[PDB]
Paper text:
Myophage Mu is a representative of contractile nanomachines with a simple tail baseplate. It has the capacity to infect a range of intestinal bacteria and has extensive applications in genetic engineering research. Using cryo-EM, we resolved the three-dimensional (3D) structures of the G(+) type phage Mu in both its extended state and urea-induced contracted state, the latter lacking the baseplate, at near-atomic resolutions. The structure of extended Mu can be divided into four distinct regions: the DNA-containing head, the connector complex, the tail, and the baseplate.
Residue numbers in the entry:
A (entry chain d), B (entry chain c), C (entry chain a), D (entry chain X), E (entry chain S), F (entry chain T): 3 to 118
G (entry chain F), H (entry chain A): 1 to 176
I (entry chain Q): 396 to 494
Amino acid sequence: GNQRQGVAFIRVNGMELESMEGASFTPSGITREEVTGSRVYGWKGKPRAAKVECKIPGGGPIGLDEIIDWENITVEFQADTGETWMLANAWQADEPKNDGGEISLVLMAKQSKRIA
Amino acid sequence: GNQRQGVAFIRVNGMELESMEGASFTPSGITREEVTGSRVYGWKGKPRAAKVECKIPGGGPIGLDEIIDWENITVEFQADTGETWMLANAWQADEPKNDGGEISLVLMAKQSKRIA
Amino acid sequence: GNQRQGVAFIRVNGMELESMEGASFTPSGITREEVTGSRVYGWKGKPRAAKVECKIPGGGPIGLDEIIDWENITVEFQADTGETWMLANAWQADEPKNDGGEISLVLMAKQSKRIA
Amino acid sequence: GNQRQGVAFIRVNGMELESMEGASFTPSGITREEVTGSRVYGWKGKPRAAKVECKIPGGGPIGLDEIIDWENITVEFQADTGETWMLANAWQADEPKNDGGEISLVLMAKQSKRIA
Amino acid sequence: GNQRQGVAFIRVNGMELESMEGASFTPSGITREEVTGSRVYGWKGKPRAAKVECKIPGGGPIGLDEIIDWENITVEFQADTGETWMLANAWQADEPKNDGGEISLVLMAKQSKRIA
Amino acid sequence: GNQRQGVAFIRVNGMELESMEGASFTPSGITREEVTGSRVYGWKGKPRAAKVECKIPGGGPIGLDEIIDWENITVEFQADTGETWMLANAWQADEPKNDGGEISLVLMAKQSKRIA
Amino acid sequence: MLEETEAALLARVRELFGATLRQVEPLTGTWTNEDVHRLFLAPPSVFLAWMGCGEGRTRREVESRWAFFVVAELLNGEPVNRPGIYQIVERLIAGVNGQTFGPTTGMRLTQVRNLCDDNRINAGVVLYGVLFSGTTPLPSVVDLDSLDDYERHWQTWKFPDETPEFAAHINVNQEK
Amino acid sequence: MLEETEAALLARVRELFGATLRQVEPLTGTWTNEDVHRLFLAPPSVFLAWMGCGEGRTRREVESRWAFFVVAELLNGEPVNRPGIYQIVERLIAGVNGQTFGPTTGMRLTQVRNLCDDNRINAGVVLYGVLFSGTTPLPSVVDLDSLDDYERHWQTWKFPDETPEFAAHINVNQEK
Amino acid sequence: LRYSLRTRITQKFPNYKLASDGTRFATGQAVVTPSVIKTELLALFEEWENAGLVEDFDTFKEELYVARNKDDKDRLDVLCGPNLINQFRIFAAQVQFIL
């Protein structure tokens, strides 16, 4: 109780990635857009891939080469409240830009399972 | 009197979702665009779906898996003044991004009735 | 019996530092903050770094260069009443300045442990 | 007859905290604010959490670690005139600091009830 | 330890270019976008060229003519922590705009090697 | 024995400047700052310029024009206890003003050397 | 807790100085214009005098103001041992600064008054006087202890005086 | 470290003024209303008097307040050498400003009082008085030195008094 | 009320040991200071206040007087205002029409 989540831990193969202020998560599932004509006509389904965004301060143990060479890893998004999602067979997307000592990073996977 | 609305309670199946500062409502009806030729020529009708945009602090009783698994729910947007709209057979839309400890969420339904 | 804190001793590497007054210790922990929405929900956490700020005479045996080159030291804040805290691997923050024989040291560390 | 407030007692878990001067109590409720447009209309509500600001001597029998580990406590603000308020499941806010044998505690709670 | 990157040195043929507050690096490799159909269906590969974006104060030893006439150089992005990438056979891109005494400049190459 | 800093002497080009009270010296180095994310990680560096803030009586033999034309000088901050610092190729910062027979000089240099 | 603090200061002074100071003795009142002709000075010696106490931070602590009046002899306008008296003053300041003495803690030096006027110069006495302030707490409420076997609970309902009385004499621990 | 400081100021005054000042001598106590009829003035001369020490920045330093009482002669309502006395006061201020004097450093001028009421005018003396404040440190803790061979370690477990004793007489450096 | 309070006192506090209010009794030790009995009586008053029958509560708290029998021992002298509830019997209403 009274433990509203405000801080999150990123973990990659049990390494507890150093994440900065802004950590974001989107669980995998179905994106539910609109299909409306004359009437509202319900909704329409669309697949969605699980995506976790985190900024890493540079110079840490991980480095940037290991980031760019990540193709098959198991990542975990743990919430201080206890919300712990798991992503199997993940991979880093977009460009890992190293701006101002910060490593902008996004990790994406095809399945998100809430464990514990 | 002197009860101008500043805070709104969102409820799903009688659970009173934990909502944050920004809660938005758009009742279902007709979106009234214009068709104008040489003269103004009145307006044109277009259907609209009821929409409730709310931000939920993470780690609460509601969770995020229950959010992404909502396909058929009954929503109730109650205003502190007393205006209480109701949506039957709703569904979560867009991506429920878990950014910065906040669960951005939008709930959409094909009908909105002003009850009480 | 119910003795209160009087003087506070600031030590670096097991050696006393001359502190004038108001040498403040802030423990390492979480800064619980409000989460206000439709109603009051609870509190949100945010990690902190333990921090000792103390004022030292300039030109002393300690020297200004040794102060500005303190990348890794082991600070200890000891209350004369008996309780003492130790900073694990602290470093000098802020911008040191020798203004009128006065220097302010903000030694900040990842964690503070209540030893002894 | 028309007695006024003198000293205020701040208790946690049924035990006094030595509050030096000017202990502050803000009740939990709604913070009504003006709503001005074409003309003045009324007032707008916004939920608020109860707050107690008390200053404690440092190094006391209470200790600093026990203070900074107060996630769930039951605070009581008692006015010597007779009226007292109790905080339901209060927690320590702000950033505690033991400056010069002095610590400031902002014990913030979801609700305050006028018991006794 | 405790050496999170905040400042980086850019070097061009052993010149240590004068950099500004924000320096950005993107190592060469493969950009991993989405290839999503009915299911997530994994990801898709795409080549990426290594890029270093930096701002230079005008009037330095380097000058702007030498900037605009750089066609075959080997640059080195060194981190204060120690992460030292090198780009062989580099070339400057975009418009070296001389705005407000600052040289907005970007240098990119086809290979990025992390040396030492 | 344990002598402490008393009066501080400000010299330019091997000539004393009449500094009234509280002459301030900030050494050149790195201004370490906290790096807070999911948890506290370490410290972040940032280059800093050495700075001497002194106050000179107006209308003196030094003259205001000679002060405002100090593009390249060699400042020396000498503590009476013995330690002295020299500014290699310092220049006048800030906006000099001869208000009330008083002028403030902020002489800033790339780095300060612990000579003598 | 003041007398304990006073005893602690006296013991500390005795340990620090020993035979250097001829005697140490708490002095009633502050130094007046008659104390020189009234006391058994026996210089060199120091007297610890409580100068009261101002309001502390809390309602359970005060800022006690103590004083160390140092005495010596100035025969023929010459201090008996000027290095000795200066060393005594400095060592008394150093050993009784910051360090706790019983319940009182944070002894802070406040003033060192010369306090050597004609009344003492003509009497062959220097009276360098140190002053101190300390955060001393107040005694706690005296505890209690008693055990009586609970056996009877007399309750009376407060009806009007001449209304027939209503009461219950429970007399607990009764079995039947 | 006050006595060393006052010796430093006296030596500095002697070096600066030499034979211009007839004598220099420390003064016991601040200048009262009878010092004129009690001292061997022999004007012109200057007296260094310690006026005490206010609280310093730390618990190891204090702000010592010294005073320079300058004396001369005013025969027939006329100073003996007004340029001389003004130069004496001025050079005393200049040469004892900022410069360190032993442990004390940062000598800052604080006040200069004319300090010539009727008592000194009818006594034919001017008493221009300078004041100074300096950051003087307190003496350090006295060191120690001793070397005794460690041979025995006697430990006694604190059991109840009449409970049979438990102890270990270790006696290190024993070989067998 | 007498029945309920007799039951409560005879069940909740058998073989206990009363003590002065300032006593340093442990958490589990069977000790009932006057303050403990006062708080228990107020809680019990609330227990038969939820189910009516005692109307006011504040005046009961102020007028409640639980003391140790200074003469002799082993007797809590308890003086409590009954604060009994009243029954809605007669309704009196004046219309005073304003027209």
